[PDB]
Design a protein around this ligand. Structure first.
Ligand SMILES: [Zn+2]
Ligand SMILES: [Zn+2]
Ligand SMILES: [Zn+2]
Lengths: 48, 1098, 66, 76, 65
């Protein structure tokens, strides 16, 4: 399952599978920490 | 002449330079610099069984914080990475080893003995000396003080222990046995030795030694240390005719032993009863060497000095027997020494290094025995390098710092760092705890001693059983670090004192003690102490040396040890303070610093000992001729949270204590990293505000950059009775406009564990096939990789991370991580990391909005607490004649019997400040006086009393009485009703007892204890008792035979009940009972107890 | 008062015997310390430190009833 | 009435276990007094009221007074 | 974090007046006259501008994506 994961340090658009990946790293700065970016769907929040 | 403002300008430089967590950083830096080398030198070297082979330890050094990746690389590590990845911030220790072969040394080999955790922001950490921008880029709050460890991703802080001063004589009273006892806790290489000399009713002196079953006569053990001639004991004990008489009486009563060999044999018989002739002598010599005053020296040559010290202790005992000197109170902070982080860390490191060296010698001996001499001696370097396991040391250190159970019986040494807000963290970093058991009363220990002034906060203390046993350092406190003792000894020797062995302490001479051990005598004690004071003030010697003399007993005490609590004071000479106006000007301009003032002889630190000879003047205008020191700032005697309360001298002490304790529970922007941090729980206040009335201290300590409350408009009147009994009424429109609105964070964590054998977990959407598969609606917002989408809505029991575990205890167990059953919120961030072992680790945080509602707890800085009683529409609230609508209404009955006039003064001051456009100083003792505030309020067009005329909201006509109204600073506490409500209808049950579980998280039930049972009995409701106890929990049915009473064993195969013991089937009855009673019967039958049941019919 | 028994002439047997003789109580009923007297209403009453109820009741001047 | 007279006139005398404050340095509770002083103020008597404010020594004496009540409830 | 839009008590919009007040009081003007000039008269409004602390700037550095 290919998915997009922003990097923790440099905030780069890293895309890679996770189920099959054995070593997890950002291919730019070598960071081992990544985020899962927010989706591009509209969220509705009450302004109460 | 100087004024308190100038002294404040001087004092603020102290915190500007030193900081607030120096007691941790300095101790840890000293440990890193010299304690490791000291311990290594103490151990000496390795002595294996290999012939003509020895290892000599060299030097030990510490590298930089690094992490060994599961992949071969080794990379630098930063604190945020350790926090997120559940790593351990640590650095490797490199130790060199010199191999000695046939008495010849070779080229040393550098080896890695393990990793040692690094205290943050110390001189060896990576964050040391970095600028604010660099810290921000690294992901840390610049305001963070450091001084705590990170262990497995959790922040552990070491609280300072308060122990008795070591190597000092304390004489106490034992009226039950009429014995006068003196005790010393001798310390050497981490070992403690309680040595006591006591005098009973008979007037005979006995000595208690560790490992010696019974007390031995004083002169017996004195002869055992050599010094056999009676005149020698007579001289050592002193030269007072009554003392000589008593000593001669003891000699007459103990004339049986006259040879050192006789005494040694005697102690051999006591310590080693019923054994061989040669064994007892060696055991007695060993006990004498390393159990009697070890700090004086374990070498067999050191008998004479130990005998002299024992004679001094006996002299103290007999002097107190005659009433010359009184009992010494243990709470006097001259007799107490704090155990800092460095000392405890050194003790733990020594304990672990013992295991390390034992394992080293075992491995080397085993390898040499297994292989041949050629294999080992051919490459000694590789042999030594491959004969080491660092994990032995590393795991010991890590586990000791993580669990908090120090080796030696100490528990709770390290606790999880609190991070509720700024005050809570900074106060936790400055805590002092006592080792005494909490259950006992300890009436004398819990009280406030007079020597705590300036060293311990008088108000900040816990409420429950910890009251008086847990204390926090005052603001003007400075724990000391040790200095080379031999240099001080040489300097004192050169000062002119004759060594102890040359002459005996003639009462015409003055005794001199250095760190509690006598070192010689002098003629003029006052001249000596004046000389040392002058040298200290000039700068010839260090500023940690403290000297105090006692005229009555003619003794001089010099202290240079570790862990003393001291405070700064301005030196007064001839009635003139040495700090002049131009010095204050220089400090203000930045040309001069606090350390320069210390080195210039203007300000000197005083411990509890030196303060005995001082006569301190409280205020600058009160300085007279006899005064020797001047107080810097009296408002600094309070702890950090206690300084939050404005006008704290106008309140009752319990209310101030409650307010100080509650200042650590309020919400607010504690730290700027809350967005990217991963803590179990956290709160954020949407619109924090700086207090209008504030003490000038919190601007200096940095609180005003991270405020934790809001300014309310408070009116004092009774409204519908909904604010009775410490309840408050809050406006609805104000709440709807963003008042006290907060947010709640909680971080969940999942790990893809890698079980042995290759079977591992995985992240996926669990198909309906798997066992334990919950409803389909629970996994409704997870992406195909098994992780939840950020900014999605969860409502309880919803799966956050889908994870299936191997069936090993053709299926797949469901082990997803879901929201807590009673909680709710929105997913904030999802982090994917690679843990230390190489597997995956996912952390998810869910944020929840918390608008104020009924039951939420609010509190003021003056101790007033309450929950919201009713929320009122704006149009129903009263309004003053000038157009002000109260934000919050409190009950007038709460003011008296609580006696918190400070709250009313703050109420006046808040409105005065708001009208005048400037904040109001509310410092402890130099703040703006009340009369000035009332006059200013009068000048602005309002009544001096602070009262106003309001109109009733409903009726619309003005109230008969004018009402008091102002602005008060209120804080929202984290005890919120959304986290306390709990219900249980059926729920799950435990295993052994099958009773309802315990805890809100697992749908537990409430506790119906014994007291409720007695209450229900008192009402006389038997059937209600049955229903509450047995009917709804642990219902049971059991068959029993009617002649033995043993539990009849039913047979499902034969459909017939029978007695196995009795062989009976004619009469079997079925009886209802509780599961607990059945298990109790089983447990009684587990022992030889046989309960025979007699049955009856109703 | 000067007390000098034969055993007190030596060094080892003086202070204890002297203290023992000095300890002796006279003129007093056993185990009774100070005696405060105060009038309650129109009747004086006595209060004592320590207690010996068996022996006091036979002391003349005491009202055994109350 | 005790609350009124303590908020309006003076706190009075602070004591622990029925005795005046005595724990501290040798012969004095605080270093700001001369040794051997037995005066009213030097042993705990607070001549100020909550409305008029307390001097630092009176504040320390009052804290020493209140700690006793706290521990008393805790053990009771 | 950032200046509130409306006064908590009465509801007057004061969100736009914080920066002007801060600049004027920093320049050297008397804060009381500045607050009077801005129109804020009841002390409930003046409290919000006086006691506000700007914390949006030092939490903007840590981003979460
Ligand atoms: Zn990157
Ligand atoms: Zn049977
Ligand atoms: Zn307003």
């Amino acid at each position: 399952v290919e998915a997009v994961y922003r990097c923790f340090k440099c905030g780069r658009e890293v895309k890679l599978d996770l189920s099959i990946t054995r070593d997890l790293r950002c291919p730019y700065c070598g960071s081992k920490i990544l985020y899962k970016p927010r989706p591009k769907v509209p969220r509705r929040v009450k302004a109460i | 002449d100087v004024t308190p403002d100038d002294l404040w300008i001087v004092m603020e430089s102290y915190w500007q330079e030193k900081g607030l967590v120096r007691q941790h950083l300095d101790s840890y830096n000293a440990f890193i610099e010299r304690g490791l080398q000291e311990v290594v030198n103490e151990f000496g070297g390795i002595k294996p069984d290999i012939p003509d082979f020895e290892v000599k330890f060299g030097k030990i050094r510490v590298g930089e914080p690094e992490f060994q990746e599961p992949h071969g690389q080794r990379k630098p590590l930063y604190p945020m990475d350790a926090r997120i990845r559940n790593l351990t911030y640590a650095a490797p220790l490199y130790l060199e080893m010199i191999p000695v072969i046939k008495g010849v040394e070779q080229d040393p080999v550098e080896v890695r003995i393990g990793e040692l955790p690094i205290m943050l922001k110390s001189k060896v950490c990576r964050l040391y000396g970095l600028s604010d921008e660099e810290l921000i880029k690294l992901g840390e709050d610049p305001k963070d003080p450091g001084g705590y460890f990170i262990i497995n991703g959790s922040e552990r802080v070491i609280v300072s222990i308060e122990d008795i001063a070591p190597n000092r004589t304390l004489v106490e009273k034992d009226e039950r046995q009429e014995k006068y006892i003196a005790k010393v806790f001798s310390y050497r290489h981490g070992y403690r030795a309680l040595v006591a000399v006591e005098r009973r009713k008979d007037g005979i002196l006995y000595v208690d030694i560790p490992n010696v079953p019974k007390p031995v006569k004083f002169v017996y053990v004195m002869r055992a240390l050599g010094l056999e001639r009676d005149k020698d004991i007579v001289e050592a004990v002193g030269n007072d005719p009554e003392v000589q008489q008593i000593m001669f009486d003891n000699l007459e009563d103990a004339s049986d032993i006259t040879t050192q060999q006789e005494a040694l044999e005697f102690i051999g018989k006591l310590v080693a009863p019923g054994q061989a002739r040669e064994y007892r002598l060696k055991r007695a010599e060993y006990v004498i060497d390393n159990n009697l005053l070890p700090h004086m020296g374990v070498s067999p040559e050191d008998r004479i000095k130990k005998a002299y010290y024992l004679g001094m202790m006996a002299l103290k005992v007999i002097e107190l027997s005659l009433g010359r000197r009184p009992e010494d109170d243990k709470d006097h902070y001259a007799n107490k020494r704090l155990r800092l982080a460095g000392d405890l860390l050194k003790d733990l490191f020594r304990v672990a290094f013992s295991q390390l060296v034992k394992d080293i010698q075992y491995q080397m001996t085993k390898t040499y025995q297994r292989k041949g001499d050629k294999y080992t001696f051919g490459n000694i370097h590789r042999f030594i390098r491959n004969s080491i396991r660092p994990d032995v040391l590393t795991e010991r250190i890590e586990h000791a710092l993580a669990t908090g159970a120090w080796p030696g019986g100490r528990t709770g040494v390290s606790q999880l760092l609190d991070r509720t807000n700024y005050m809570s963290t900074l106060s936790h970093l400055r805590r002092v705890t006592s080792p005494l058991d909490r259950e006992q009363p300890h009436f004398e220990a819990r009280d406030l001693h007079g020597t705590h002034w300036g060293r311990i906060c008088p108000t900040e203390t816990p409420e429950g059983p910890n009251c008086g046993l847990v204390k926090n350092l005052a603001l003007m406190a400075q724990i000391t670090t040790a200095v080379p003792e031999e240099e001080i000894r040489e300097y004192l020797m050169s000062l002119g004192i004759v060594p102890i062995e040359v002459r005996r302490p003639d009462p015409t001479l003055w005794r001199v003690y250095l760190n509690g051990v006598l070192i010689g005598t002098i003629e003029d004690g006052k001249a000596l102490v004046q000389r040392i004071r002058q040298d200290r003030r000039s700068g010839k010697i260090s500023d940690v040396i403290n000297v105090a003399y006692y005229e009555d007993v003619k003794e001089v005490y010099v202290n240079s040890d570790d862990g003393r609590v001291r405070r700064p004071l301005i030196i007064v000479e001839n009635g003139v303070p040495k700090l002049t106006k131009e010095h204050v000007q220089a400090v203000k301009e930045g040309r001069l610093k606090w350390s320069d003032l210390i080195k210039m002889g203007i300000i000197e630190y005083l411990d509890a000992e030196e303060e005995e000879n001082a006569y301190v003047a409280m205020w600058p205008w009160e300085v007279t001729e006899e005064h020797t020191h001047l107080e810097l700032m009296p408002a600094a005697i309070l702890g950090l949270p206690a300084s939050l309360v404005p006008y704290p001298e106008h309140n009752a002490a319990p209310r101030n204590t409650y307010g100080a304790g509650m200042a650590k529970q309020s919400l607010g922007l504690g730290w700027a990293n809350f967005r990217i941090r991963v803590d179990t729980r956290g709160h954020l206040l949407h619109y924090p505000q700086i207090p209008l009335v504030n003490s000038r201290i919190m601007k200096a300590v940095g609180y005003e950059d991270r405020p934790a409350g809001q300014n309310f408009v408070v009116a004092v009147l009774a409204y519908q009775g909904y604010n009775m009994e410490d309840a408050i009424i809050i406006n609805k429109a104000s709440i709807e406009r963003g008042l006290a609105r907060s947010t709640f964070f909680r971080t969940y964590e999942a790990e893809e564990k890698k079980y042995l054998g290759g079977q591992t977990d995985k992240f996926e959407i669990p198909d309906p096939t798997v066992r334990g598969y919950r409803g389909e609606k629970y996994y409704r917002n997870l992406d195909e990789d098994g992780l939840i989408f950020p900014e999605s809505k969860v409502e309880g029991k919803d799966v956050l991370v889908g994870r299936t575990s191997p069936p090993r205890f053709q299926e797949r167990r469901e082990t997803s991580v879901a929201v807590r059953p009673s909680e709710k919120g929105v997913v904030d961030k999802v982090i994917i990391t690679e843990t230390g072992d190489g597997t995956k680790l996912v952390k998810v945080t869910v944020r929840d909005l918390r608008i104020p509602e009924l039951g939420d707890k609010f509190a003021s800085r003056h101790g007033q607490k309450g929950v919201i009683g009713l929320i009122v529409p704006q149009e129903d609230m009263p309004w003053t004649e000038s157009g002000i609508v109260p934000d919050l209404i409190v009950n007038p009955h709460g003011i008296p019997s609580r006696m918190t006039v400070g709250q009313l003064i703050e109420a006046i001051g808040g409105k005065v400040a708001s009208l005048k456009g400037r904040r109001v100083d509310g410092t402890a003792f130099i703040g703006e006086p009340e009369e000035k505030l009332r006059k200013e309020l009068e000048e602005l067009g309002f009544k001096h009393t602070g009262r106003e005329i309001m109109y009733d909201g409903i009726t619309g006509k003005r109230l008969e009485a004018d009402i008091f109204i102002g602005v008060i600073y209120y804080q929202r506490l984290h005890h919120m009703v959304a986290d306390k409500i709990h219900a249980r209808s059926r729920g799950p049950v435990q295993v052994l007892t099958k009773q309802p579980t315990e805890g809100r998280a697992r749908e537990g039930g409430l506790r119906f204890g014994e007291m409720e049972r007695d209450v229900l009995v008192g009402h006389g409701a038997a059937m209600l008792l049955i229903e509450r106890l047995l009917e709804e929990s642990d219902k049971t049915e059991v068959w029993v035979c009617e002649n033995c009473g043993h539990i009849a064993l039913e047979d499902k195969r034969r459909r017939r009940v029978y007695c196995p013991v009795c062989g009976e089937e004619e009469r079997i009855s079925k009886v209802e009972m509780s599961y607990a009673f059945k298990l109790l019967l089983d447990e009684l039958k587990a022992m030889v107890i046989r309960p025979k049941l007699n049955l009856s019919e109703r | 008062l000067i007390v000098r028994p034969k055993k007190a002439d030596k060094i080892s047997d003086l202070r204890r015997f002297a203290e023992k003789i000095k300890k002796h109580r006279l003129k007093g009923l056993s185990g009774v310390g100070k005696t405060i007297v105060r009038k309650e209403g129109d009747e004086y009453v006595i209060y004592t430190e320590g207690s010996n109820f068996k022996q006091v009741l036979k002391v003349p001047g005491v009202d055994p009833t109350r | 009435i005790l609350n009124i007279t303590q908020m309006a006139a003076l706190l009075g005398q602070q004591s622990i276990r029925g005795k005046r404050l005595y724990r501290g340095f040798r012969g004095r509770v605080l270093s700001h007094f001369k040794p051997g002083d037995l005066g009213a103020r030097a042993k705990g008597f607070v001549v100020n009221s909550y409305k008029s404010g307390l001097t630092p020594q009176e504040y320390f004496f009052h804290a020493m007074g209140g700690r006793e009540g706290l521990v008393d409830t805790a053990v009771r | 974090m950032i200046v509130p839009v409306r006064c908590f008590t009465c509801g007057k919009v004061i969100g736009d007046k914080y920066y002007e007040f801060k600049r004027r009081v920093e320049a050297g003007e008397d804060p009381e006259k500045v607050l009077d000039d801005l129109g804020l008269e009841r002390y409930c409004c003046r409290r919000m501008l006086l006691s506000h602390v700007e914390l949006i700037d030092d939490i903007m550095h840590y981003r979460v994506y």
